[PDB]
Structure 1
Amino acid sequence: AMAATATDKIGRSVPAPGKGILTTAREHHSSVKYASPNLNMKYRKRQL
């Protein structure tokens, strides 16, 4: 359902791992007070 490789920046220093993959969870929690309709299926089914 998902595959994603990730890297910091330019090939700089190989033998040390880092944050890279954490970006597979980049989402925005600035305003979570309202409900996001797209997460429901009963709503996405009606549009379809």
Structure 2
Amino acid sequence: AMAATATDKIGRSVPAPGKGILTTAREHHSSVKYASPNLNMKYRKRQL
């Protein structure tokens, strides 16, 4: 379903593990009061 890679940030320890892969869950919550047709499969289907 998904496959992703991420680097982390400025650093000086090559073997230290980091949180770049957190980015796979990135999404924008500034405007979120009403549900989004794009997430609703019935809508997507109707459009197809």
TM-score for the superposition, normalised by structure 1? 0.85
What is the CA RMSD across the aligned residues, in angstroms?
A: 1.7
Specify every segment of 5 or more residues in structure 1 that has no aligned partner in the other structure, as ranges: none
What's the offset of the Cα at 1:28? Answer: 0.2
**Number of residues paired by the alignment?**
48
TM-score for the superposition, normalised by structure 2? 0.85
User: CA 1:21 to 1:27, structure 2 compared with 1: closer, same or farther past 3 Å?
Assistant: same
Name the % identity.
100
Moved over 6 A (4+): none
User: CA 1:28 to 1:39, structure 2 compared with 1: closer, same or farther past 3 Å?
Assistant: same
Specify every segment of 5 or more residues in structure 2 that has no aligned partner in the other structure, as ranges: none
Distance between the aligned counterparts of 1:40 and 1:23, measured in 2? 23
What's the offset of the Cα at 1:25? Answer: 0.7
